[PDB]
Coordinates of C-alpha atoms and ligand atoms in Angstrom, one line a residue:
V1 CA 1.7 -7.1 -1.8
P2 CA 1.6 -4.5 1.0
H3 CA -1.9 -5.7 2.0
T4 CA -1.2 -9.4 2.0
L5 CA 1.9 -8.5 3.9
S6 CA 0.1 -6.6 6.6
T7 CA -2.1 -9.6 7.2
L8 CA 0.8 -11.9 7.8
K9 CA 2.9 -12.5 11.0
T10 CA 6.5 -13.2 11.6
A11 CA 7.9 -16.6 12.4
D12 CA 7.8 -15.5 16.1
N13 CA 4.1 -14.6 15.8
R14 CA 4.3 -10.7 15.6
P15 CA 2.5 -8.6 13.0
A16 CA 4.6 -8.1 9.9
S17 CA 3.5 -4.5 10.0
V18 CA 5.8 -4.1 13.1
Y19 CA 8.7 -3.9 10.6
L20 CA 6.9 -1.8 8.0
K21 CA 6.9 2.0 8.1
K22 CA 4.2 3.7 5.9
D23 CA 6.4 6.3 4.1
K24 CA 9.3 4.0 3.2
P25 CA 9.9 1.6 0.3
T26 CA 10.2 -2.0 1.3
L27 CA 13.1 -4.4 0.4
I28 CA 12.0 -8.0 0.7
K29 CA 14.3 -11.1 0.6
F30 CA 12.6 -14.3 -0.3
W31 CA 14.3 -17.4 1.0
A32 CA 13.9 -21.0 2.1
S33 CA 15.4 -23.3 4.8
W34 CA 16.6 -25.9 2.2
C35 CA 18.8 -23.3 0.4
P36 CA 22.5 -23.4 1.5
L37 CA 22.9 -20.0 -0.1
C38 CA 20.1 -18.6 2.0
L39 CA 21.3 -20.2 5.2
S40 CA 24.8 -18.8 4.6
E41 CA 23.3 -15.3 4.3
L42 CA 21.0 -15.1 7.3
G43 CA 23.6 -13.4 9.4
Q44 CA 24.5 -10.9 6.6
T45 CA 20.8 -10.0 6.0
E46 CA 20.3 -9.5 9.7
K47 CA 23.2 -7.1 9.7
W48 CA 21.8 -5.2 6.8
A49 CA 18.4 -4.9 8.5
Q50 CA 20.1 -3.1 11.4
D51 CA 22.6 -1.1 9.3
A52 CA 22.2 2.6 9.0
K53 CA 23.1 2.2 5.3
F54 CA 19.6 0.9 4.6
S55 CA 17.8 3.2 7.0
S56 CA 15.7 4.8 4.2
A57 CA 13.9 1.5 3.6
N58 CA 12.0 -1.2 5.4
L59 CA 13.9 -4.5 5.2
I60 CA 12.1 -7.9 5.8
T61 CA 12.4 -11.4 4.6
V62 CA 9.7 -13.9 3.6
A63 CA 9.7 -17.6 4.1
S64 CA 6.8 -19.5 2.5
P65 CA 5.9 -22.7 4.3
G66 CA 4.4 -25.5 2.0
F67 CA 5.7 -23.6 -1.0
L68 CA 8.7 -24.3 -3.3
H69 CA 9.9 -27.2 -1.2
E70 CA 9.7 -25.4 2.1
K71 CA 8.7 -27.1 5.3
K72 CA 5.0 -27.1 6.0
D73 CA 3.5 -24.4 8.3
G74 CA 4.3 -25.0 11.9
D75 CA 7.2 -27.3 11.0
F76 CA 9.0 -24.3 9.5
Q77 CA 8.6 -22.1 12.6
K78 CA 9.8 -24.9 14.9
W79 CA 12.9 -25.4 12.7
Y80 CA 13.6 -21.7 12.5
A81 CA 13.2 -21.3 16.3
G82 CA 16.4 -23.2 16.6
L83 CA 18.4 -20.5 14.9
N84 CA 19.3 -17.1 16.3
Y85 CA 18.8 -13.9 14.2
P86 CA 16.6 -11.8 16.6
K87 CA 16.9 -8.7 14.5
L88 CA 16.0 -10.4 11.2
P89 CA 12.3 -10.0 10.3
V90 CA 11.0 -13.3 9.1
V91 CA 7.5 -13.1 7.7
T92 CA 5.9 -16.5 7.1
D93 CA 3.6 -16.7 4.1
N94 CA 1.9 -20.1 4.2
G95 CA 1.4 -21.2 0.6
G96 CA 3.6 -18.5 -0.8
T97 CA 0.8 -16.2 -1.7
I98 CA 3.2 -13.2 -2.3
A99 CA 5.9 -15.4 -4.0
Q100 CA 3.4 -16.6 -6.6
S101 CA 2.0 -13.1 -7.1
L102 CA 5.5 -12.0 -7.9
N103 CA 6.4 -15.2 -9.7
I104 CA 9.4 -15.9 -7.5
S105 CA 11.0 -19.2 -8.5
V106 CA 14.6 -19.1 -7.3
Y107 CA 16.2 -18.4 -3.9
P108 CA 17.2 -16.1 -2.8
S109 CA 15.3 -13.4 -4.7
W110 CA 14.7 -9.8 -3.8
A111 CA 11.8 -7.5 -4.4
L112 CA 11.6 -3.7 -4.0
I113 CA 8.2 -2.3 -3.2
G114 CA 7.7 1.4 -3.6
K115 CA 6.5 3.4 -0.6
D116 CA 3.0 3.5 -2.3
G117 CA 2.9 -0.3 -2.5
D118 CA 3.7 -0.9 -6.1
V119 CA 6.2 -3.5 -7.1
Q120 CA 9.2 -1.7 -8.7
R121 CA 11.8 -4.4 -9.1
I122 CA 12.3 -8.1 -8.7
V123 CA 15.9 -9.4 -8.6
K124 CA 16.7 -13.1 -9.0
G125 CA 19.5 -14.6 -6.9
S126 CA 21.7 -13.2 -4.1
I127 CA 22.7 -9.6 -4.0
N128 CA 25.7 -8.0 -2.3
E129 CA 25.8 -4.7 -0.3
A130 CA 26.7 -2.6 -3.4
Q131 CA 23.8 -4.1 -5.4
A132 CA 21.5 -3.6 -2.4
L133 CA 22.4 0.1 -2.1
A134 CA 21.9 0.6 -5.8
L135 CA 18.5 -1.1 -5.6
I136 CA 17.5 1.4 -2.9
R137 CA 19.1 4.4 -4.7
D138 CA 17.2 3.6 -7.9
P139 CA 14.7 0.7 -8.3
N140 CA 15.6 0.5 -12.1
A141 CA 19.3 0.9 -11.6
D142 CA 22.0 -1.6 -12.8
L143 CA 23.0 -3.2 -9.5
Ligands
CL201 CL1 26.2 -10.6 -10.1
CL202 CL1 28.6 -11.1 -0.5

C-alpha cells in the first residue's frame, strides 16, 4: 500500500507523499462522492487531519474513481473541486487499486498502516473520535 500510495496524487494534483511522513503510521479513510455518510463527514475528517490529537500519525483519505460506483477519473476531480476542504488530503486511486488490495467494500472504511508499511487494521464503516484515538493507540484495540 505505501508504494502504490507514493505513486498516486491528490485530487488537486499533488504527490500523495506530501502528506506522508516516513516514521509515522498512516490512517486512511476510504470514501466516495455518492455516500451521504461520507459527504456529511468531510468537514469532520478535515478537522481530524489538522488536530493535534492525531499528530502521531499521517491522516489521508482515498477516493477511487471508476471503482465502487464512483465517478470516473477526471469527472471525480471536477466534482470535488466544487467543495472546500483545503486541509483534507484526498488521494485519487483510479480503479481503486488500494481498495481492492485491502478488500474495501463499504464506505466509509478505515485502514491503519504501520510506520513500516504493513496493514495493521481495517475498520468497516464510520468511526468517531474516540474510536480513531483507540485505533492510533493500539491497531488491535477495541475501538
Ligand atoms: Cl459502533
Ligand atoms: Cl460522530
